[PDB]
């Protein structure tokens, strides 16, 4: 659903966002 995928693309970018960083730190 794109509808969806616009408020879902915040809960997906908070969850990688976070590893994403973590890995660095």
Same mark, same amino acid.
């Given at each position: 659903?794109? =509808?969806?995928?616009?408020?879902? @693309?915040? =809960?997906?970018?908070?969850?990688? @966002?976070?590893?994403? =960083?973590?890995?660095?730190?």
């Amino acid at each position: 659903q794109r =509808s969806n995928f616009h408020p879902l @693309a915040a =809960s997906f970018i908070v969850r990688c @966002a976070f590893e994403h =960083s973590r890995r660095f730190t």
